[PDB]
Fold Non-haem bromoperoxidase BPO-A2, Matrix protein 1 chimera.
Amino acid sequence: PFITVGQENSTSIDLYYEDHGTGTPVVLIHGFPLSGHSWERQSAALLDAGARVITYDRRGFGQSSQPTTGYDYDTFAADLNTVLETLDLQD
Amino acid sequence: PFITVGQENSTSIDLYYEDHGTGTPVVLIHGFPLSGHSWERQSAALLDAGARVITYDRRGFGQSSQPTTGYDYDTFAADLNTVLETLDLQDAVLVGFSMGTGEVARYVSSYGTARIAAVAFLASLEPFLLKTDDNPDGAAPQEFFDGIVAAVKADRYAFYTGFFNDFYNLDENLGTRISEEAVRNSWNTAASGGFFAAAAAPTTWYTDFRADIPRIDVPALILHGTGDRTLPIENTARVFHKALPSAEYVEVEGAPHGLLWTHAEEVNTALLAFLAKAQEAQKQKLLTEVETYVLSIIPSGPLKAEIAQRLEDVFAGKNTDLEVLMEWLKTRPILSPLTKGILGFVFTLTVPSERGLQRRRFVQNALNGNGDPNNMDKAVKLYRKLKREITFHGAKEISLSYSAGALASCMGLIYNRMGAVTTEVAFGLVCATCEQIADSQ
Amino acid sequence: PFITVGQENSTSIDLYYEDHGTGTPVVLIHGFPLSGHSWERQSAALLDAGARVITYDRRGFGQSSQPTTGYDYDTFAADLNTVLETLDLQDAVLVGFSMGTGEVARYVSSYGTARIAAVAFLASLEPFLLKTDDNPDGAAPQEFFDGIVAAVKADRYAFYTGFFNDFYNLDENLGTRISEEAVRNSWNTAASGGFFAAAAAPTTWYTDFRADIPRIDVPALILHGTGDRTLPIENTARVFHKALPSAEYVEVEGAPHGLLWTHAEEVNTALLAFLAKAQEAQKQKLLTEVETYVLSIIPSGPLKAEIAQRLEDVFAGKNTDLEVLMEWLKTRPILSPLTKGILGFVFTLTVPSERGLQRRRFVQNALNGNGDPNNMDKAVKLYRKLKREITFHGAKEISLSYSAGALASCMGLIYNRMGAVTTEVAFGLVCATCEQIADSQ
Amino acid sequence: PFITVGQENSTSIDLYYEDHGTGTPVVLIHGFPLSGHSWERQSAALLDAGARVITYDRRGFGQSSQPTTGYDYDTFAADLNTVLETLDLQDAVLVGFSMGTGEVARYVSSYGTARIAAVAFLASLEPFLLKTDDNPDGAAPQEFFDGIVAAVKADRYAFYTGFFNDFYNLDENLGTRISEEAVRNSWNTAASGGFFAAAAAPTTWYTDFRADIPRIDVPALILHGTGDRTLPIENTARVFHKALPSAEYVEVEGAPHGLLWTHAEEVNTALLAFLAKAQEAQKQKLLTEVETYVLSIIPSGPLKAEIAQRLEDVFAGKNTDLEVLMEWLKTRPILSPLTKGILGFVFTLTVPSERGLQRRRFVQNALNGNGDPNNMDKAVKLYRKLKREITFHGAKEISLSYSAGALASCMGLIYNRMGAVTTEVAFGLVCATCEQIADSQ
Amino acid sequence: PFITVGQENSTSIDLYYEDHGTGTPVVLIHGFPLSGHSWERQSAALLDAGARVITYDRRGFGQSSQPTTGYDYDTFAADLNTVLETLDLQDAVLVGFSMGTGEVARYVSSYGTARIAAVAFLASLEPFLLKTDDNPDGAAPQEFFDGIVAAVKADRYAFYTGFFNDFYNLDENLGTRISEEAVRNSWNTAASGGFFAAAAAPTTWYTDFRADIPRIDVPALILHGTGDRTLPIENTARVFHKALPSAEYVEVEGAPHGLLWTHAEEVNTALLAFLAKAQEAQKQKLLTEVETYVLSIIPSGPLKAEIAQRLEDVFAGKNTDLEVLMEWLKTRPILSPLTKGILGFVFTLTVPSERGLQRRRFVQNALNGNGDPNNMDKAVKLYRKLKREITFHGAKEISLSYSAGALASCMGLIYNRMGAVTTEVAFGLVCATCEQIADSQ
C-alpha cells in the first residue's frame, strides 16, 4: 500500500505503508537504514494486545520512493502529517 | 501484475500474479514458504510444450500483500476463485505443490469444476495430516505443529535454514541435484514473505481435506517423492490414492519434498505426458468440431469423402506436403472458389509444416471480400475484437454478428499475415464463416 | 454525363461530356455542326493506344443545353475552363477540329498552359478568316459570312445538306471514303443541335486569333487537308504555320474538311505518333517522379546506385526477371526491411513480367504493420478513398493526410490483393509513403 | 514508478523507471543481468554535475515486468521509444552499458535523432559479436552463445556467480576495487530478474548492429575497459571505432567489463567532460533561443546591436561586471523602461558574478506592475504553477496563458526574491513575456 | 427513367428503363442492336392481357449509358440483378429475345430463381454458338465472329443495313410483314447505340451457356422462327430443347430472327397462353396450403373427408353450384357455426361462379365478431394493413398479430363487401384465423 506525499520531476513521491489489526492506532516510525518491517517483533505483540498497528517506510527506505529531495525533519514530519491526515487517525 | 482479493483496514489485499504463453491455461499454486517463481523449471517446460502458464503468490508470500488476516483454506480458495473469475479462465488445469494442493481440493470441493478440465497434486497435504483417534494415518500429533509455529515465531530466518535442509534433503542433494546458489535463492524468497504469514501458515497444514476428496470430479494426477521428509509419502500420497483410486498416481523414487527443482525432469515428464494426452484430446474436441463446420459447406459426394479423409489425416498429425495438398484443392472440379479458399486456409493453419510455402493466389482471391472497402472495414473491426479473444467459442460467437462477406475478408486479412490471432480463435472465425455460408444454402 | 457551366433564366446551362479510358488525358473539341461523338474513329485509336479520352458537346450542339446566349470564343473558352477545372485535369492534351481550334487558341491565350502538356489544331480557323485591309490573307469578306447566317436562318435542315457536301467533298468521297449512312448520321446530329446555336455559330468563325498565337507555349501540331473546301488551306493552316513556325506541321494530301472520317488513318496516324509520344513522354516524367521519391528513402552509397540503375532498367522495360530481382533485394545488407518492402512492392508493380511468382514474405512482413487494428482501420479508410482516385497526384495528395504507419499498411493491403487500385494511384500511394518516411529522417 | 509498454495475455507489461534531478536529461540503459540501480555511482556524479537522470529496468530485469515475450532489440528499442515519448524528452543524452549499447544503436538507427543530443557507448556489443565468414572480427562462434543459454537454463543462480567473476575480474579486483558486499548486491539483483529473460537475453547479444552505425548522427563517445573479459575490446570497441572514426574514444587501462563500479572515477570523468561539452552546446542553444525572444522586444538599430553583443558575451561567459552592465542599461536612451527591466532581469540571471550587488530600483519599478492587486493576484497564481515546472518549454507554455501585465509582475516577484524558481523556468517566463509584448507591437 | 448500375471514371453507368401497367411483372430483355422499345408489339398485348410490363435498355444501347466497359454476360446479368432488386420484383417472368436470352440463362444460373416465376427464350443464343471440337453443333467457327467485329468497326452504319436484311428476311418480308418505315426506325435505334458497344457486343454471342441450362428451375418456354438466318434454329433452339426437354417448345414456321415484329401475332399468342398457364400454376400451388390450414380446424372423421373432397374439387376448377354447396354446409351436423362460416367464406371466394348468389345469413352471423365494437375496431385496423399487402405470407403474418375474434370480424368485413382485398391476401387472412382457432384447440 502507498500514500503519495509529493512530487519529484515527472514522478510522484509515494510512501509504502501497512495497516493491521483493530483498536487504538499505534504508529511505528523506523530507524536508519531499515524499514517498517523492522518492527515485526513489536507489531506481533501489539496485535495480540489488541491495537491497530500502522507502519510506513520513510522516503528513500524500504519500499518507499527514492527521491533525491526532502531529507530533513520538517519534510519527514510533513510526510508523517500526510499519513495521519490521509488515514484520519484519532487518538 | 496484481489482482485485488480484499481489504485490510485502510489497505487493499493484492495478489502478485504472472500470465505467460498461449494455449490451454495451466494454473500453478506454490508451496510454503516460496512463491510463484519456484515453478520456473516447470513453467519453462509448459511454455515450450505450448500451454498458457498462470502463477500467483499466495497472500503473505513472495510479492503479494502481507496482511495479518485470512490464513485459512476457505480464504485461500476464495482468493484462487477471484483469480479464476478475474481472468475468466475456461477449461483450466489446476496444479498445486505442497500447500497449493490444499487450494486445489478446497476450491474444487466448494466451487465445483465448471472452469476446470483437470487437477494435479504434487507433494500433497491430503487427506488429513493431523494424527487423531479418528485419523490414525495422520502424520503427526497437534503438539508437533504447535512446535513449528513456536519455532518460526522465535526466529523465522534461522528456521528457514533447517527447513530447506529437509525440504531439499540437502545432506543427499547439495552439489548434485541442487546448487548452493539455488538454495540461497529459496531462503531469500522465504525471508521476503510476511512475518505474520510465516507463523500463521503452519496452522493451516492439518486442515481436514477428507470431505473435499469425493468432490473431485475431473481427471486427477497424484505425484509424490518417496524420499519426502517434509510430507511422509505413507501419511499423505499413499492414503490419498486409496481415497481417490481413480487418480493417476506417480511415485518419484527417492525424491525429496522439493522435487520441483531436484527432480524437475521426472516431474515435468509425468506432468507433460498427462498434459499431452489432455492436449491431444482437446485437438480431437476442437479438430472434430472444426471438421463438422468445414464439411457443412461441401456438397455431399465422393469429393466430400476425400476432403474429410484429408482433414482427418492432417488433424491426426500426418505431416502432409502442403504444396501437394493445395494443388489438389486448386484443381478440384465442382468445388466453389470460396469453399476452396476456406479449405486452403484451414489446411495451411492445421498442416504441421508449411515448409516455407508462399501463400496461394487462389486462396487470396477467394478470401478478399470482393475487394469491397465496406466489407474490409467490418473485417478490420471484427479482427480488433478477435485479438481480445482466447477461446474457440468466444471467437466463433462474436464472428457470427458479422456478415459472410466481412467474415471471409477477415479470414483473408489473417491468411495474408496482415493481422494475427491464435489458432483456436482462427478456428472459431472459420467455423462462424462456414456456419453463415452453409445456413445460406 | 453533364457539367453545368452557367445559368439562362430559370434553367442551368449543362454540357454533355464523356470520360473514357485511363492514362494521359486527351480532350477532343468538336466542329460545327457536330458533337463529341464525331471523334469516334479517333477516340477508338487513342483508347487502344492507352490514353484517357475526354469529349464534350459545345453549348447548342449534340446533347448539351441549347441556350440563346454565350455564342462567342471567350464564353466557349470559359466553358472549356470549367470542364478542365471540374475534372482537375493535369498534363492534358487539347485537340480541336475546325471550330474547336478556336477554343484551343483562346483558352491557352487567356488561361495559360498550367494544366496543358500539348496542343493540336486540325482543320484550323486560325489565324483570322475575315478578309480585311489589315488582313489580306483572310479567306472571305464579311458579306460572305452574313450570307451563311441568312442561309441557316432560312432553312437550317436543307442547309446542312449542301454543307456536308463540301464538308466531306461528297462528289469525290461518297461510296469510297464515306458511306451514305455515315453522312446520314452527321445530318441527324446537326438537325439535333439548337436552332439558335446553328445561326449564331457562323458569326464566331471570323474571330481574330492573331494575338492568341504568340501565347502558345507548349508543343503544337498543325494538321490540314489540302482538299479542304470549307477552310482553304492557303488562308488558314499555311499562314498559321508562318505565325507559329515551331508547330509540327502535316498536310493531308487531297483530304477534305471532314478528314476525321474520310482520312481517319491519315490524321489518326499523324496523331497517334503524337499521343503515343506524349504518353511515353509523360511516363518518362512520371517515371522520374516515382524514382526520385523512391530513392529519397535510400541512404546514399553504392547500393543506392545499384537500386537506381535497376529502377531505371525496369522502367525502360529492359530488366525483367522479378524472381532474381526480389532475391537480390531480400539479401541486401544495410537496407531497412521497410525500405526493402517498398522497393519489393514497386518492382512487382513496374516489372512487366511478374510471371507466376507468389507474393514475397519479406515484403508482406515489411508492409503489414505489426497488426495494430487502429492502423489497419486507417489503411482501410485510405483504400476506400484511393479506390475513387484515377490520377497520381490526387492519389498522392489524399495519402499525405495519413500517417506513415497507415500508409505502409495500405500498401500491404494492395500488395496482398486484399484491395485493388490502378497503377498510377498505387504510384501516388507509394510516393506519399516514401515522402513521409524520408521527411521523418 | 512505471511506464506500460505493452500487453502479455491478461497482464500489461510495465517498465520500472526513476526520474531524478533537473537540467539536461540523461538516460542510462543498464546491462545484463542488472538493473537501473547499477548506475548509482554514475547517477550521483551526474546529479552533482547538474543533469536530469533517467533510469529504467529493461523488461525481465530488476523491478520491471517479467514477460516471456519481446526479447529482441527492435522490441527493446520500441520499449525505449515509449519511455522517451511518454516523458516528452527533448535534447536527451542516451548512455548504454553493455546490453544497453544495443538499445542506443537500434533506437538511433530506426527512430532517428530528433529528441537526441548525444550518445555514449560503454562496454559495447557493437558492431557484431557473432563470428562468421562475413564477420571475421566476431568475438565467438554461434555454438559459444548456445552454450551460455544452456548454462543459464541449467542453474541461473549458480551461473550468476561465475559470470560476476569475469564480469568484475574478481581475481584482480575483489577487496581492492570491488567489495564482497557490492558483488553480493549484484547477485541479488540478478537473482531477482525473470527466469525466462535470463535465458532469453544471451540470444540477443550477437545482434548485427553493422547497419545501425552509419545512422549515428549526433556526437558519440565510445568507452571500453582494456581488461574486459566479457566483451573483448579487440572484437568490439576497437572495430566499432573503425566503423565510427568520428566517435570520441576512450580506453580504460586494465578496466574489466564491470567498469561502472571498479573504475567509476575514470568512467565519470570521461562521461562528465563529454557531457559538459554537450551541455555547453545545449546552453548555447537555449541562450540563442532566449536571445532571440529577448531581442524581439528591442527596436531595430545600433543599440539593438550593442545589446545583442552584450547578451552573446555574457552567454559565452566573457562579460561579467554586472554593476557596469546595469548602469549602461539604466542610462540607455530610447529603450522603454519595461524593456530595460526585462534586460536588467536577464543580465542578473545570466551573469555568473552578481557579486554583492543590490537589486536595482529601475528594474523593480519596471517589473512591479503599478501595484494593481488583480494583476498581482494573477502573477502569484502563475508563480504557484511555475514552481512545479522544471523545463523551459513547460514554463514558457503556462506563462503564455497569462497577460503581459501579470507576466511582468511575476518576473518582479522573482527578481525581488519574493518567490524562487529554477533558471530554465525563469528563462521560459521571460521569453513568454517577451513574446507577448513583441506580439502586441 | 434510369437505374444506376455502376461507375465509369468520373461518370455513373445508368440504364434507361420503363415500367408500365399493373399485375404480374413481366421483364422484357431486348436484342442487338435494338432497345426496350423494340418490344412495343408485345408490350401492348401484355398490357391489354393485364400484366405489369418492365423494359430496359442494355448498357451501350438505346437510351442507356455508353461505357467502354462491362460487355460480358456476368456484367449484363449483374445489371439485370440490380434492376430486379431496385424494383423489388417478386414472382417475375423473364423474357429474353436473341442477346436477351443470354441474360435470362446467366441470371437464373448465378442468382437463382427466388424472384422468378417463369422464363421464356425467344430466338435464343443457347446453348453455345461457337463451333468447336467439344461443341460440334456450334453454328460457326471463331473466325466468323472475328469477322463481324471487324465489319462493325469498319462502318457500323453501313453494317446495320445488311444486318437488318437478314435480321428481318427483307427479301421475303418487306412490304408484307414489315414496312420500310418500321425498318427505318430499327436502323435509327441501332445508329443511336454506342460505337464501342456495337463492336464489343458480337464477342459476347459465343458465350457458353451449357452449364447455365441445368440451373433452370422454373417453367420455361423456348420459341424460335424456322426461317431464322441470324440464329440457325438447328444450332440453337433445337439443340437447346434437347438440353431442356422440360421446356415448352414452339417453332414459328418460316419466321425470321426479327419475329417480334413480322410474326408479332404468333409470338403474342404463344407468350400469352404460357403466361396465362403460369398464373394458374401459382394458384394451384397456393390452394393446397390453404386447404391444410382450412382442414386443421375440422374434427377428424367422414365429414372432414367430404369437405376436403369438395375443397379439392372447387380448387381443381370443377365449377360448383355454390347455392347447393352453401346449403349442404349450412345443414351439416357437428360442425361449429364458426367453422361453417369460415368454410362458407372460403367456398364463395374460390368457387368459379357465385352466379349472383346473395350473401348467406349463416356465414354473416358466424363471422360478425360477436358484434363487439372493440373486435370490430381491431378488424378495421387489420383491414387497413391488409390493404397494403400483396402476398399470402405477408397477409398471413400481420393477421397473426390479431386475436381470433378480430380476425373473424375482419373476414366478415370482407365477406360483407364492406372492404376489399386481393384473393391471395384474403387467403392469408383466413389461414391466420384457422391457425389461431386450431391452436386454441
